[PDB]
Structure formats: C-alpha cells, structure tokens
Amino acid sequence: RRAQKHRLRELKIQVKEFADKEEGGDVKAVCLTLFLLALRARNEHRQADELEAIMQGRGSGLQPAVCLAIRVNTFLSCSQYHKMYRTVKAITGRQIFQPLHALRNAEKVLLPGYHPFEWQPPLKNVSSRTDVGIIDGLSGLASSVDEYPVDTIAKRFRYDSALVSALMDMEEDILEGMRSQDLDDYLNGPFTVVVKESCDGMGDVSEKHGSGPAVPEKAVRFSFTVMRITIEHGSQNVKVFEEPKPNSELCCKPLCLMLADESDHETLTAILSPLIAEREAMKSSELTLEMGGIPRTFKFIFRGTGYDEKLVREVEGLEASGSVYICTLCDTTRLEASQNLVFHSITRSHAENLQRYEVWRSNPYHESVEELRDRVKGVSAKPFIETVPSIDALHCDIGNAAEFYKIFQLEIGEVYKHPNASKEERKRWQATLDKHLRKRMNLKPIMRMNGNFARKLMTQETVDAVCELIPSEERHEALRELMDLYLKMKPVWRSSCPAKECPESLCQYSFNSQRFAELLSTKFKYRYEGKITNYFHKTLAHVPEIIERDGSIGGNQSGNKLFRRFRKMNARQSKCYEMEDVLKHHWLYTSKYLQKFMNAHNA
Amino acid sequence: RRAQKHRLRELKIQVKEFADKEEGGDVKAVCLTLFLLALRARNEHRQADELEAIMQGRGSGLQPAVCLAIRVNTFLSCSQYHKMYRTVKAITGRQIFQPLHALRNAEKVLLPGYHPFEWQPPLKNVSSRTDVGIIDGLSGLASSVDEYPVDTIAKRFRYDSALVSALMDMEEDILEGMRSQDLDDYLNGPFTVVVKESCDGMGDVSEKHGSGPAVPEKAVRFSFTVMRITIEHGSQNVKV
Numbered sequence: 077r078r079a080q081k082h083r084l085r086e087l088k089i090q091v092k093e094f095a096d097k098e099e100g101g102d103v104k105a106v107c108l109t110l111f112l113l114a115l116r117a118r119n120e121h122r123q124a125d126e127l128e129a130i131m132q133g134r135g136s137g138l139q140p141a142v143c144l145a146i147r148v149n150t151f152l153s154c155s156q157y158h159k160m161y162r163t164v165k166a167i168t169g170r171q172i173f174q175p176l177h178a179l180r181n182a183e184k185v186l187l188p189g190y191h192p193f194e195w196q197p198p199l200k201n202v203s204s205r206t207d208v209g210i211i212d213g214l215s216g217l218a219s220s221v222d223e224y225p226v227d228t229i230a231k232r233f234r235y236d237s238a239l240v241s242a243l244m245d246m247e248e249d250i251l252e253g254m255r256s257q258d259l260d261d262y263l264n265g266p267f268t269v270v271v272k273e274s275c276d277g278m279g280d281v282s283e284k285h286g287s288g289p290a291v292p293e294k295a296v297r298f299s300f301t302v303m304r305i306t307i308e309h310g311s312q313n314v315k316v317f318e319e320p321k322p323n324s325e326l327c328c329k330p331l332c333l334m335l336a337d338e339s340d341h342e343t344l345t346a347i348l349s350p351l352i353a354e355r356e357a358m359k360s361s362e363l364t365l366e367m368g369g370i371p372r373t374f375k376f377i378f379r380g381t382g383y384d385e386k387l388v389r390e391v392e393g394l395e396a397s398g399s400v401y402i403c404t405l406c407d408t409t410r411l412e413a414s415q416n417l418v419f420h421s422i423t424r425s426h427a428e429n430l431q432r433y434e435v436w437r438s439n440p441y442h443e444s445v446e447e448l449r450d451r452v453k454g455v456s457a458k459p460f461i462e463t464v465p466s467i468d469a470l471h472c473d474i475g476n477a478a479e480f481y482k483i484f485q486l487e488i489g490e491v492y493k494h495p496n497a498s499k500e501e502r503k504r505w506q507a508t509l510d511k512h513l514r515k516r517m518n519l520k521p522i523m524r525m526n527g528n529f530a531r532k533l534m535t536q537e538t539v540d541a542v543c544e545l546i547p548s549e550e551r552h553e554a555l556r557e558l559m560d561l562y563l564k565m566k567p568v569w570r571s572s573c574p575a576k577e578c579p580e581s582l583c584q585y586s587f588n589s590q591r592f593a594e595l596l597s598t599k600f601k602y603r604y605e606g607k608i609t610n611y612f613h614k615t616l617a618h619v620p621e622i623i624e625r626d627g628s629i630g631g632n633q634s635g636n637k638l639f640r641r642f643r644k645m646n647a648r649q650s651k652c653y654e655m656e657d658v659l660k661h662h663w664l665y666t667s668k669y670l671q672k673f674m675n676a677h678n679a
Numbered sequence: 680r681r682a683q684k685h686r687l688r689e690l691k692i693q694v695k696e697f698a699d700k701e702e703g704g705d706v707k708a709v710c711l712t713l714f715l716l717a718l719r720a721r722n723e724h725r726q727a728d729e730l731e732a733i734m735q736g737r738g739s740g741l742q743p744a745v746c747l748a749i750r751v752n753t754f755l756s757c758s759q760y761h762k763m764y765r766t767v768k769a770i771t772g773r774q775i776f777q778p779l780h781a782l783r784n785a786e787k788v789l790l791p792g793y794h795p796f797e798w799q800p801p802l803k804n805v806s807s808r809t810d811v812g813i814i815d816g817l818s819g820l821a822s823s824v825d826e827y828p829v830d831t832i833a834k835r836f837r838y839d840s841a842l843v844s845a846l847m848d849m850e851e852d853i854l855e856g857m858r859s860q861d862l863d864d865y866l867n868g869p870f871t872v873v874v875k876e877s878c879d880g881m882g883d884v885s886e887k888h889g890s891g892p893a894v895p896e897k898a899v900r901f902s903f904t905v906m907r908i909t910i911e912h913g914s915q916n917v918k919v
C-alpha cells in the first residue's frame with residue numbers, strides 16, 4: 077500500500093481535487109460511484125449487487141444483535157465465543173462475527189435504563205433519574221448486627237425502567253401491528269397496556285455432588301408479562317397487539333430475584349413492598365415515549381392473576397388450608413359447599429378485606445373468638461397485595477376425575493345397601509377395579525394422580541366397561557348422563573377462547589350444572605359426607621363469572637432448570653455479582669427482539 | 680446511473696488516459712487500489728478487507744473439519760450447534776456452516792479404524808480386519824453370575840488402529856519436516872518411532888445429587904504418546 081500510494085499519489089490528488097471542486101470534499105462517495113461503474117463496464121453485475129450489499133452491510137455482516145441472540149440462546153461463555161470469533165476470522169480472512177466490546181454495546185442498548193422518557197404526572201416517591209439498571213433488591217436494608225438479621229440476596233430492577241425497556245423492545249412489533257390493523261404509522265396515544273402479574277418460587281437450586289446434604293437453598297422470582305395492547309380512534313377501540321402464548325417461558329420478564337423461602341413472610345414482604353409502592357404510584361400516571369420518531373402516551377392496567385393457591389392464601393391474609401373457608405371468591409364454608417353447589421357469587425375484594433382486617437383488629441362488639449372467626453370469614457392478616465385470582469384447566473379436570481374415581485369405587489361397592497363397610501373391603505373393591513381396568517383398558521394404575529391418567533380415564537368406553545360390572549342399569553344411565561354433562565362442560569374451560577370457540581356450550585352452563593347438581597344431590601346422595609374440594613367448588617360455582625370477567629382459563633420444572641443452567645454456565649462468584657449476572661442474562665433471554673431474530677428459519 | 684455517468688464522463692476519460700499512460704489500459708487494478716487506499720484512510724478497514732476477500736475470490740463457506748474442530752474445542756452439543764447452523768443459514772441466505780451429516784462423515788474419516796494398512800509379519804493372535812474401532816475393553820469377559828463378578832465398564836480401541844490413525848494425522852507434520860530437512864517426498868522407511876505410555880486414575884468422576892455422597896467412583900484412562908519420529912538413511916539418522 078505504501079508503494080501503491082507512491083504510484084497513485086498524483087491520481088489521488090486529482091480525484092480529491094475534483095471532489096472538493098464539485099461536491100466539496102466527498103472523496104469517499106465519488107470513489108464508491110467511480111469504482112462501481114468501473115466494475116459495471118465489465119458486466120459483472122453479481123459483484124455490483126454484492127458491493128451494494130456490503131456497503132449496505134446486509135450481506136455477510138452479522139449485525140451484533142443477531143450474534144448476541146445466538147450467544148444468549150446457545151449458552152456460550154465469553155472465552156469460547158472469543159475463540160470461535162478469532163478462529164473463523166483467521167480461517168476466512170473476513171470478519172463474519174463481531175468482537176466482544178460491540179457485543180457489550182449491543183447488550184447495553186437492550187438493558188433497562190437506556191432510553192429517555194418522562195411522565196405527565198411527576199410520579200411521587202420515585203427518583204426521576206433515568207439511567208438506573210440493576211439495583212440492589214433490598215432498597216437499602218439494615219444489614220448491621222444490632223438489627224434483625226437477614227441473609228438473603230436480592231437483585232431487582234426499577235419497575236418503570238423495565239416497563240420502558242420492554243416497550244422499546246416490542247416497538248417494531250407494535251409498529252407493524254398498527255400498520256396491519258389499517259391505521260397510520262403516525263398516531264399519538266394513549267396506548268393502554270394490560271399487563272399480567274405473577275410470582276413463583278422455584279424450589280431448590282443447590283448442586284452438591286457430595287459432602288452430605290449441603291443446603292436446601294430456596295429461592296423465588298417476581299416477574300411480569302405484557303399481555304395485550306389496545307388503542308382507540310375516536311370512540312372505536314382496537315386490539316392493536318395480542319400475545320399468542322401467555323404462560324410460556326419466553327415472555328416472562330423478571331423484575332426481581334431473591335434467594336429466600338416462599339413462606340418466610342417478613343423478608344418476602346420487606347423486599348416486595350417498594351415494587352408495590354412503585355406500582356401504585358404508576359397506576360394513576362401517564363408515560364411519554366419517543367419510539368416511532370414521534371411521542372406517544374401510555375396508561376396502564378395491572379391484573380395480578382399469575383399466583384398459585386398457597387401463595388394467594390398467604391399474601392392476601394387468608395387461612396392457609398385447614399379452615400372451613402375454601403373459596404377465594406365466595407365466603408362459602410365447607411359445610412355449605414357440600415350443601416349448596418352453585419348458587420353463589422363473587423364477594424371478595426381488596427378494600428373490604430382491609431376493612432375486615434380492621435374489624436379484626438378493633439373488635440368493636442367485644443364478641444368471642446369463634447364468632448369473630450366466622451364474622452370475618454377467615455381474615456387474619458393485614459392484606460398488602462391486590463390480586464384477582466383465577467384457575468387453570470388441569471386442576472379442574474383433575475378434581476373432577478379425583479371425584480369420579482371415588483364414585484366408581486362406591487359404585488362397585490353397592491354401598492347404597494351396605495351403609496358401612498370395612499376399609500379393606502373398599503381396598504379390595506379398588507383392587508378389583510384396578511384388575512378390571514387393566515384387563516379391559518390396559519391401563520397401569522398408580523396412587524398418585526396426574527393430568528395424564530385423569531385425562532385418559534374420561535372416555536365413554538371406560539365408563540361403559542365399569543358400568544357393565546354393576547347391575548340395575550338405571551345406574552348406567554345415571555353415569556351416562558353424568559359423563560355427558562362432564563364432556564359437555566369440558567371444552568368450555570378447555571378452549572382458551574370460549575366466547576368464540578364454543579359459545580353454544582358456554583350457554584346452557586348454569587342449566588347443565590344445575591342438572592348435574594340435581595343428579596348428585598338426589599341420585600348419588602351418598603357422597604354427602606361434608607368432604608368437598610375447593611377445586612370442585614370453583615368448577616361448580618365460579619366458572620361463568622370468571623369467564624365474563626376475562627374470557628380465558630389461560631410447566632413446573634421450567635424456571636428452575638433454566639435458573640440452574642444460568643447459574644452453572646455463565647456466572648461470577650462471591651454471591652454479589654452472581655445474581656446480577658443471572659438476572660441480566662434472564663432479561664436478555666426473555667427479549668422479543670432476540671427471539672424474533674432467532675426463529676427466522678420458519679420464514 | 681446515466682446521470683452520474685454524465686457527471687463523471689470527464690473523470691472516466693481522465694483516469695482512462697492515466698490508465699493507458701501509467702500501466703497501459705489497467706483501469707481495474709488502479710481503480711481497485713484507489714478504492715482500497717481511500718477506504719483504508721477512512722479507518723473502517725472491515726469493509727476494506729471484506730472487499731479484498733470478495734474480489735480476490737476467498738470462499739465464504741468453509742471445510743467441515745474446521746466446524747468439527749471448533750465444535751469439539753468449545754464443547755457444544757449437536758442440538759445447539761444445529762440451532763446455530765440453521766440460524767446463520769436463515770440470516771445469511773447463503774450457507775457457510777455445515778449440517779451434521781458431513782460432520783459425522785469427516786469424523787469417521789478422522790476416527791481410527793478406517794484406513795487400510797498392512798504388516799509384513801503376520802502378527803500372531805491379532806485379527807486381520809482393518810475396520811474395527813471402538814470395542815469392549817472386557818475382551819469377552821463373561822460376567823455371568825456363576826463366575827467372578829465385576830461391574831467395571833471398559834471401552835478400548837485396537838492399538839495398531841490408534842497407531843496408524845495417529846500416523847495418518849501427523850502425516851502432514853512429517854511431510855513438512857521431510858521437506859524442511861533437505862529431503863524428498865518419495866522416500867521409503869523404515870521410520871523408527873519412539874512411543875511412551877501412561878495410565879493414571881483420576882479419583883472421583885461422579886456428580887451424585889439424589890442423596891449426596893453415594894460412592895467414590897474411581898476411573899482410569901490408559902493412553903499412549905508419540906514423542907519422536909526418525910529415519911536413518913545412508914550413514915546417519917535425522918529427527919524428522
């Protein structure tokens with residue numbers, strides 16, 4: 077290049093002097109065009125569009141977000157990716173991948189705390205500094221010796237910044253969504269965003285090959301998911317964005333992680349309370365953003381539905397499990413639940429629960445303990461988290477089949493004429509049923525019940541096989557009608573869109589459930605022993621109100637295995653940088669941008 | 680195109696004159712090196728050597744063996760590799776990496792038990808097949824319950840297979856050494872090879888998590904190592 081510079085210096089002076097005498101110092105672009113047409117005179121057009129692509133960079137360039145998605149999805153550490161990059165860079169001569177600092181900039185553009193924004197109300201008790209990332213989850217606790225001891229490790233994001241980064245991630249999708257729904261690319265807000273709210277612990281995360289049992293080491297995440305986005309034009313609203321898979325593992329963006337027990341109450345609420353404060357400050361605010369070159373405004377709505385049963389009974393203030401109070405919507409006792417089957421409503425709310433707890437504190441009528449216990453309907457603790465509860469179809473049909481197995485046990489028992497039996501007589505009845513189902517169905521019995529055995533039990537042919545063993549075929553007709561009502565009721569909560577999929581089955585729901593209640597209360601009037609499952613109470617009573625409220629009934633070892641993967645593969649030690657690392661890599665794993673690049677094979 | 684051609688017709692005819700007067704109708708290399716010098720003075724050299732590789736004729740895709748090398752050296756599973764391969768194929772359009780078929784093909788090429796060879800002695804108590812690799816280390820130890828009971832799993836090669844495979848992939852090294860130390864390629868042997876051997880146990884190799892410490896399971900590899908290849912020609916020998 078030095079001797080080429082010596083042979084080409086005069087020509088270089090001439091081309092730069094034409095550049096500054098025609099364009100004004102634009103030697104690069106004119107050099108591009110003259111070399112391009114110098115190749116175009118030899119009709120090698122493949123190389124011409126190739127040079128267009130490499131000046132475009134969209135050829136074999138690999139924009140750093142793509143290889144970042146590759147490294148995150150394939151679980152590569154830094155040294156190995158550096159090895160792969162330098163080896164392919166050496167063997168091809170061209171630099172097809174990217175180096176590490178560009179990868180760090182490409183990940184710094186996707187973390188929380190990068191884009192600017194503001195809020196039309198000034199967001200009381202929130203620091204308006206706009207470049208905060210992973211902060212300490214303890215919000216400045218009091219870890220000194222003279223204080224209450226707490227040895228947990230919690231790392232969190234601020235709520236608003238993570239919401240902002242999630243919206244900036246789904247920016248391109250919401251652009252093409254509002255294009256596809258026959259509207260303009262220019263449109264001010266307000267976009268109203270409905271957000272799923274969830275929390276769950278992932279059990280044990282310890283890995284000890286020996287040294288006895290090491291540590292139980294329970295931990296728990298707190299996460300959210302953007303469910304749907306909507307917008308009006310004048311008075312007509314439109315769903316501008318809907319999510320296809322709500323409960324999947326690729327759309328659960330985490331706020332905070334802590335290594336703590338799920339039931340360790342005070343530490344849990346002490347870490348989770350400032351995020352609650354941020355949520356309630358955010359409930360009555362207005363976000364303003366600059367995504368599509370123009371400002372947009374945002375309101376928000378939060379649905380706390382992603383909780384499980386033991387946790388919602390714990391963090392709202394109810395009894396754990398051993399009460400007479402089983403319904404988290406209706407105040408029906410266990411006594412009345414066996415008695416009244418469907419005629420209830422939804423009567424539990426947050427503010428009245430606060431009022432009931434204040435009644436439990438004050439005790440204004442100086443009554444005794446048990447009448448307080450039935451007056452407040454199981455309210456014992458101060459409520460501190462708003463939560464709208466729901467169900468899932470696995471618990472519904474597993475409670476159904478757990479009833480039905482006992483129904484067939486009493487049906488082979490002929491217990492209507494044997495008012496008592498020995499327990500081992502019922503064990504022999506059960507064992508004859510087991511031999512019977514193995515000899516007819518070829519089914520393998522098991523004491524534990526999962527969704528699989530429960531789902532493959534409910535067939536017309538198996539209920540035919542079990543009613544063929546019993547005489548008095550009015551019993552066969554009774555279980556036939558009963559199974560018919562069951563299979564009618566099944567795809568209602570087994571559709572995920574029952575307002576649209578099976579509206580005929582959605583209608584006549586109170587009609588068929590009242591029929592089935594009349595069947596169980598009159599014909600099979602021997603199950604009435606007071607034993608009733610809360611799952612069954614929810615399937616009988618609390619179905620259609622949940623349906624008209626939401627419209628849906630929409631993987632245990634999922635977060636924990638992935639958490640062990642992140643902790644073991646790519647992590648720093650000392651228990652301080654570790655949680656920041658797994659939190660950051662989890663947030664990078666959960667981006668819509670990277671997954672959208674990652675599954676490009678289907679196109 | 681015709682507009683900028685009209686704008687730069689003087690430039691085209693000017694460097695046309697300069698190409699005829701400097702190197703005699705050599706517009707291609709002159710205009711190319713002008714682009715290279717300009718875009719390297721731009722200090723954005725990734726585009727520059729990309730254009731250099733594409734105008735030299737450097738191939739985009741690569742050998743299967745290099746994919747095998749980087750896969751082994753990074754310790755990656757076939758699932759994640761296949762995901763990476765299909766993503767780069769979907770993004771780039773053209774294919775650069777390889778799928779698993781040619782990988783396993785070049786693998787069994789490089790594996791022992793594939794290439795023919797012979798022995799001038801007949802090698803008593805040794806089989807005649809040249810195409811057996813991995814076998815049981817038990818050598819037909821009947822482990823029925825009526826006999827002495829063991830449980831030690833043992834896998835092994837055949838020794839001569841390992842020797843000939845080690846020779847065939849050090850073949851390029853000994854070729855370069857023969858070209859370095861003043862000889863030809865058309866030499867015959869007998870090449871004298873010095874081989875040391877070793878085995879050592881490694882202590883526990885187990886990750887027991889069902890209940891903690893189950894068994895200190897001790898394993899042991901047995902291995903060989905070449906360290907010297909020589910040839911004696913005429914009077915003396917030479918460490919090739």
Ligand SMILES: [Ca+2]
Pocket residue numbers: 879880
């Ligand atoms: Ca040793």
Ligand SMILES: [Zn+2]
Pocket residue numbers: 403404405406407408420613614617618
């Ligand atoms: Zn209820």
